[PDB]
Design an enzyme around this catalytic site. Sequence first.
Site, mmCIF file in Angstrom:
data_model
loop_
_atom_site.group_PDB
_atom_site.id
_atom_site.type_symbol
_atom_site.label_atom_id
_atom_site.label_comp_id
_atom_site.label_asym_id
_atom_site.label_seq_id
_atom_site.Cartn_x
_atom_site.Cartn_y
_atom_site.Cartn_z
ATOM 1 N N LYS A 1 0.842 -1.182 0.000
ATOM 2 C CA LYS A 1 0.000 0.000 0.000
ATOM 3 C C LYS A 1 0.890 1.248 0.000
ATOM 4 O O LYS A 1 2.101 1.140 0.210
ATOM 5 C CB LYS A 1 -0.943 -0.048 1.203
ATOM 6 C CG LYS A 1 -2.006 -1.127 1.079
ATOM 7 C CD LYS A 1 -2.813 -1.254 2.353
ATOM 8 C CE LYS A 1 -4.015 -2.143 2.148
ATOM 9 N NZ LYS A 1 -4.905 -2.131 3.337
ATOM 10 N N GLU B 1 -8.673 -10.463 -7.801
ATOM 11 C CA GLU B 1 -7.696 -9.401 -7.648
ATOM 12 C C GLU B 1 -6.624 -9.486 -8.729
ATOM 13 O O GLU B 1 -6.234 -8.470 -9.311
ATOM 14 C CB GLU B 1 -7.056 -9.454 -6.254
ATOM 15 C CG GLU B 1 -7.995 -9.075 -5.114
ATOM 16 C CD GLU B 1 -7.402 -9.362 -3.744
ATOM 17 O OE1 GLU B 1 -6.228 -9.782 -3.684
ATOM 18 O OE2 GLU B 1 -8.117 -9.198 -2.732
ATOM 19 N N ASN C 1 -1.935 -0.115 7.201
ATOM 20 C CA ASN C 1 -1.430 -1.420 7.581
ATOM 21 C C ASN C 1 -0.453 -1.963 6.546
ATOM 22 O O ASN C 1 -0.278 -3.175 6.404
ATOM 23 C CB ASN C 1 -2.612 -2.371 7.798
ATOM 24 C CG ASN C 1 -3.439 -2.581 6.540
ATOM 25 O OD1 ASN C 1 -3.309 -1.847 5.559
ATOM 26 N ND2 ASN C 1 -4.328 -3.562 6.583
ATOM 27 N N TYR D 1 -11.681 -2.350 -4.135
ATOM 28 C CA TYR D 1 -12.425 -2.465 -2.884
ATOM 29 C C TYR D 1 -13.921 -2.614 -3.116
ATOM 30 O O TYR D 1 -14.742 -2.174 -2.302
ATOM 31 C CB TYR D 1 -12.141 -1.273 -1.970
ATOM 32 C CG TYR D 1 -10.781 -1.329 -1.308
ATOM 33 C CD1 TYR D 1 -10.446 -2.382 -0.461
ATOM 34 C CD2 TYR D 1 -9.840 -0.326 -1.508
ATOM 35 C CE1 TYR D 1 -9.208 -2.439 0.158
ATOM 36 C CE2 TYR D 1 -8.600 -0.376 -0.891
ATOM 37 C CZ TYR D 1 -8.293 -1.437 -0.059
ATOM 38 O OH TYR D 1 -7.071 -1.512 0.560
ATOM 39 N N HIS E 1 -1.416 -5.416 1.550
ATOM 40 C CA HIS E 1 -2.641 -6.188 1.353
ATOM 41 C C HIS E 1 -2.367 -7.553 0.719
ATOM 42 O O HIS E 1 -1.506 -7.680 -0.152
ATOM 43 C CB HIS E 1 -3.629 -5.414 0.474
ATOM 44 C CG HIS E 1 -4.676 -6.277 -0.162
ATOM 45 N ND1 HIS E 1 -5.842 -6.630 0.482
ATOM 46 C CD2 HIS E 1 -4.717 -6.885 -1.373
ATOM 47 C CE1 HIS E 1 -6.564 -7.401 -0.311
ATOM 48 N NE2 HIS E 1 -5.903 -7.575 -1.440
#
Lengths: 146, 144, 144, 144, 144, 146
Positions: free
Chosen positions: D10, D122, D108, D50, D111
Amino acid sequence: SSERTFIAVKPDGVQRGLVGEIIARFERKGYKLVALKILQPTTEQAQGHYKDLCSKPFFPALVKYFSSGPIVCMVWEGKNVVKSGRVLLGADSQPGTIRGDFAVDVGRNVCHGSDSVESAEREIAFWFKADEIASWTSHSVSQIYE
Amino acid sequence: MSSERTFIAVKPDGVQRGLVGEIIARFERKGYKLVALKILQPTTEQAQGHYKDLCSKPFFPALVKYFSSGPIVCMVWEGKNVVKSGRVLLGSQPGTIRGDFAVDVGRNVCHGSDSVESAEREIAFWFKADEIASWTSHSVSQIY
Amino acid sequence: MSSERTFIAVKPDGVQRGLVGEIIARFERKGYKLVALKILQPTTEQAQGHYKDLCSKPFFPALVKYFSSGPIVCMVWEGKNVVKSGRVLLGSQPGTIRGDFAVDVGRNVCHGSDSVESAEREIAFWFKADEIASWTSHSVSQIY
Amino acid sequence: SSERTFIAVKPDGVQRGLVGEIIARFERKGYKLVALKILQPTTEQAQGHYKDLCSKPFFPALVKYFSSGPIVCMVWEGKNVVKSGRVLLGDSQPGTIRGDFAVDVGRNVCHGSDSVESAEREIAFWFKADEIASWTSHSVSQIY
Amino acid sequence: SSERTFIAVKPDGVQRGLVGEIIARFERKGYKLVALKILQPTTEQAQGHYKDLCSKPFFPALVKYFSSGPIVCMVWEGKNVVKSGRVLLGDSQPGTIRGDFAVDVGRNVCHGSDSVESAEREIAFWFKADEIASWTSHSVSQIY
Amino acid sequence: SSERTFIAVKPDGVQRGLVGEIIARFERKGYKLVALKILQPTTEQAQGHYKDLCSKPFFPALVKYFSSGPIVCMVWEGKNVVKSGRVLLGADSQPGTIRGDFAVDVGRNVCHGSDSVESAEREIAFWFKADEIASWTSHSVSQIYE
């Protein structure tokens, strides 16, 4: 300033799982990653990359080695990145460098970096399209540069 | 000879980039003994005094509040040829701190005393005597 | 919330074994901000006061000058949920400080505040206000 | 089998220089890199990525953050790569990527596909068939 | 070729927990471990090992130090293993074993054969033929 | 106190160059190395080590894998070393552990550690002679122990 260099992990480097290690060393040095991809060169891609050696001995062997498996292509951006890139790779290569730490033989020297600004943009244009190159802001840019 | 001390400082860029622990770790693994340690944001006067020898240079003002633009970590290390070993650890070719982490001379991550002379000065400048802990490590006869 | 602080100390065994830089490095990489740092050999009174809550236990005297038997490194870290994150980093299963480096409870390398309550106490105990550097790191908007 | 998972660093992870570290942990685990690229997601790409969270109130923030800077897209191949990928990322425990480097859930660092289903989705979303390298690791009979 | 070198971690290196680190650096370089053992040298063994230095005034000290504690004996196999071994050990520069971990020449952590000649001598002295493993690395055509 | 455990790097672990990494993790934990050697097990050594599985399925396969290449044998000494050793190795194994970091499959789980004090001395006596075991003083012993 907006200088760029081309770095490639050779098939031995990929196979030995040294891709992450190399990327990390460039990152920790403070340089900015702007292009990245993995591919197995075709014969012609291998030929073109080593075109300067078309008059040099055993060129076919070099061509079929380089095309024998996947490489990881990178472009890094930052001050003196071409020169620092060669330094990070090493040569008689010294520990602390990529080759100093992981390579024994010239034919299996894990990685390649452009030897000049001349060479870098040639190598970059060859391996990457303009749209494959990311333009972005390192938040740490003025902690690294004056 | 094993009472030799050197002064090491992680510059604001070094602190900012989270390289304090790494640098300290490289000195420990070399076998040197930490005897003083602190973090502070230098005042202008502290920055000027530290660079007292450069007060006549045109880049002194620029150098002075860059150095006071953020926190530094001050250290003193004790051991045989630690002054020289410190400079060697800093670097620049890979394996050293500047070789591994730095690109610009104005952003060279860290500073070390260039001589025993300079070392006594810098330590005395940044630390008072009560701030210097003196102790004997159990690995002293493994290292020296 | 990002003004939360925790107190971390590398115990004499941790200092002795050269684990200071490693521990600091693990906090930095987690994204926390160092705001206070010092090394000292605790006096008996400092050791007693720190363990004030244990003064009625039979192992208090033993615990007290073990703690003053050598230098400790005192730290304060600032950031969201740093008190809890500190305890998590310390551990014990591998990946944590005690999990990686320690065998004995009496030799558990490092200490961290068990609560925000305890944290305010420990910091106030070991550090005076002028010793706490407050600064804003450029990666703050990358971490939080 | 030749199971595949999608891994993306990310924007904070890229900005914090954590790409190589993450790639290394997958390599050290014995998994095979079969796809790799860096790009800054458009708003439209982030929304599509998302998609399953479009009814969540924090969906908009996820979209702006994910499209706020460059990400590194990866595909890894090997047995249990989907689950092991999730395990490697990490209430996260030290030793894991989020355990080692992240503090808050919105930043975080990285992913990974939560299922084989999600993985194929994905992968198909971010990569064309031509971008996926097919090759055999020489270490395959040492790993499996 | 199948060139071999002798590597020994000296007593300080063992005591300081540097055995695995050293073994790792040889492994990461791509060399093949073919012999391995730990022992405390007798006075007689240390003298025999340092046979070529028996006329040196620091010979006695070398003998008592080398026989003062356990060493780890190793044999590594591969092209230029003798020279590369020496290069890895390291006036030593950071990145090398002595550069990273040693301060004084009498406690330089580790030893490597200075020549192929010395290597065959050292190997024959410390190891019997039965102790040397013969095997092929699966990574051999990735290294050479 | 003078507790000992047996640790072995399996052929996959040796081949993948994980010997040094494993030794280092035990060292940094504060444990004392007292025995060490490298060898390729004979069929009978492989059989004896896995003797408890002689009634278990596919025993020959296990035997010929274990004897297919070199292993590194170790003995470590220290408090709770048997229990801590298993913890350092891992299982569903978690990152930070040897298997958590480097292994994917149970048949290729890099390393073995004795599951009990019972098992450790059996395994130790099997693989090492008394004279192969070094007796020595860790200078850091009372910084690790009370």
